[PDB]
Design a protein around this ligand. Sequence first.
Ligand SMILES: *[C@@H](CC(=O)OCC)[C@H](C[C@@H]1CCNC1=O)NC(=O)[C@H](Cc1ccccc1)NC(=O)[C@@H](Cc1ccccc1)NC(=O)CCOCC#C
Ligand SMILES: *[C@@H](CC(=O)OCC)[C@H](C[C@@H]1CCNC1=O)NC(=O)[C@H](Cc1ccccc1)NC(=O)[C@@H](Cc1ccccc1)NC(=O)CCOCC#C
Lengths: 302, 305
Amino acid sequence: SGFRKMAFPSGKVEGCMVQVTCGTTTLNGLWLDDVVYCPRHVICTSEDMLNPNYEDLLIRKSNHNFLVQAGNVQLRVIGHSMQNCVLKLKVDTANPKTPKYKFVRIQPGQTFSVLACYNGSPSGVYQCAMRPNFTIKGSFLNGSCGSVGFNIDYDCVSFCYMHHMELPTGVHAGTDLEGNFYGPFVDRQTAQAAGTDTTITVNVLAWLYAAVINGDRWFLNRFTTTLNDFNLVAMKYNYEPLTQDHVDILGPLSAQTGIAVLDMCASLKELLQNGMNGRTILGSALLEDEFTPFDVVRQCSG
Amino acid sequence: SGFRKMAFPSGKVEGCMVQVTCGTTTLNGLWLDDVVYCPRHVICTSEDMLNPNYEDLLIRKSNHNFLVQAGNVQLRVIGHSMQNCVLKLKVDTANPKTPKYKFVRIQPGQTFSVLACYNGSPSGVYQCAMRPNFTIKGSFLNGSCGSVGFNIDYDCVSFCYMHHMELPTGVHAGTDLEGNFYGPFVDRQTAQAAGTDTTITVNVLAWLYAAVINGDRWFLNRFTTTLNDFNLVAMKYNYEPLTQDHVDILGPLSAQTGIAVLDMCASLKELLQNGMNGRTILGSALLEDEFTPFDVVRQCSGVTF
Ligand SMILES: *[C@@H](CC(=O)OCC)[C@H](C[C@@H]1CCNC1=O)NC(=O)[C@H](Cc1ccccc1)NC(=O)[C@@H](Cc1ccccc1)NC(=O)CCOCC#C
Ligand SMILES: *[C@@H](CC(=O)OCC)[C@H](C[C@@H]1CCNC1=O)NC(=O)[C@H](Cc1ccccc1)NC(=O)[C@@H](Cc1ccccc1)NC(=O)CCOCC#C
């Protein structure tokens, strides 16, 4: 029993974290096989960050301008190239601690673990969700760029995020491991912001199933609803529309609890329209939307 | 910016997790130097676990009854001892991945990272606090016993919890690595109630400081209270008394924000008496009490390990 914001164990990723320096700029890189991946703005200077021409800025660099430190051992760069918004530095040694891995591009509403690092050294691990507006609500300070987000399926690490920027509102933007930003953001020190965020409906429902599994049941009612009638109330409260694919994804949780998805939707509708009345669910006075159906099964199955 | 429930990196601990099997019972152990630590109830059978005499149960075992698996190598048990509620299996090989470590007994209100493990394989990491009633609000399933909790300081891992039990209310009870349970709980298959809990005041204040550092300021006010007047409200709302030691511990955060502790206390008093009026603080509609002042400093200053 119990339900926590649970990240994946971070060791397999800790073994791949390195420090990358160019000029006076230092940030984190991800060392997999004989390649180090890092944000390309490691080649910028303070004045240049406004409208940087990365093609030219990289022309002026040689392999020896890139200092890569794994612990207190220096790796020797023997090639460099740019892929979208990430730099790839080829080094002369493969990382012995390389795990089985893949690069994936995740969809809004999906979750991942972040290993926050500074100067190639890990500082902490936490769980995030790709918001519908393609930001993440992270915890990142100066020096954290190059920190990565990941999921672990068995012993395979699926890297899905590398950190680049903090938006004016305190949320965060970055790229997949092929250097493509999530959302309409660019690696420039310019006026940027995607406001107007929405709640991830299928995640709230999964979390309500988690509550039921854990014995919190006060919000269950006898009523039911249709998908169209639920979705009318949903968009009124800034919830993502619920689709049949979402309903199907919740099949396993519905089966474990005996509660059909549309019955849960009726409970959810009443919560949105009436509040919780000074009550809590799984220790929260808000409806949580950063647990996916898989996160719930993973943590209520082990 | 941003403020998350942040655990320590778990790699140093992952390297110490092993599987311990005794008969049909399998659970997790902690392999440090040439000793494997695990809950002593691994030696129980379904006909014993009610009111077991653990000394008799261990006299009746031998080294070969214990089956210890470190990844894909079998460790040879060469000795066994019991200290309080923790079993100590001496093995023939020292763990090459042993970090600098300490065994520490933590105080209610102190937080730690839990590495939830099954069959000796780490499964996830999350943050917990030792509650005032000496339970922890963990996330554990069958197979999780022997999972440990810990804090890190530079390179030293301070182990403070090993998991043994879930209470009927769904919260958890365990020992320190010296084998002494937190609270009045025992390793017997009996229902033992979590007593009434209280809110960790100093941690709530630390989290309000975290909010200020991250730009949430709406709960601040022009008032300052006295410690006495604050603690009158605290008792009524089932909050721990605030002590001068707590005020001192909050020093660094009061320094960074420029907001004195007793000034912050007047915000906490107002939130307790009037609630939050449909607003949130750091994404929460409740007052969070599982971040310590060090937790705030560590996260908002980028301390690494
Ligand atoms: C990682 C690298 C770094 O520290 O280099 C700078 C010395 C950080 C992580 C950020 C830092 C604060 N919290 C984080 O998560 N990344 C940055 O600092 C990027 C660096 C960058 C270089 C070249 C081209 C693009 C980005 N910049 C930012 O994070 C800025 C982005 C910004 C600035 C002004 C308007 C919109 C967006 N964010 C920032 O300064 C905080 C929020 O902006 C407030 C304002 C105005
Ligand atoms: C770890 C045991 C393990 O890994 O070994 C594998 C065989 C679990 C962790 C529990 C499991 C569910 N979630 C958890 O955190 N520990 C236990 O199962 C202990 C084992 C034990 C053996 C011998 C002596 C003491 C403890 N048992 C429990 O946790 C029971 C305690 C109990 C017994 C009788 C009535 C109430 C509580 N907890 C339990 O069953 C929780 C749900 O039932 C509540 C009721 C009623």
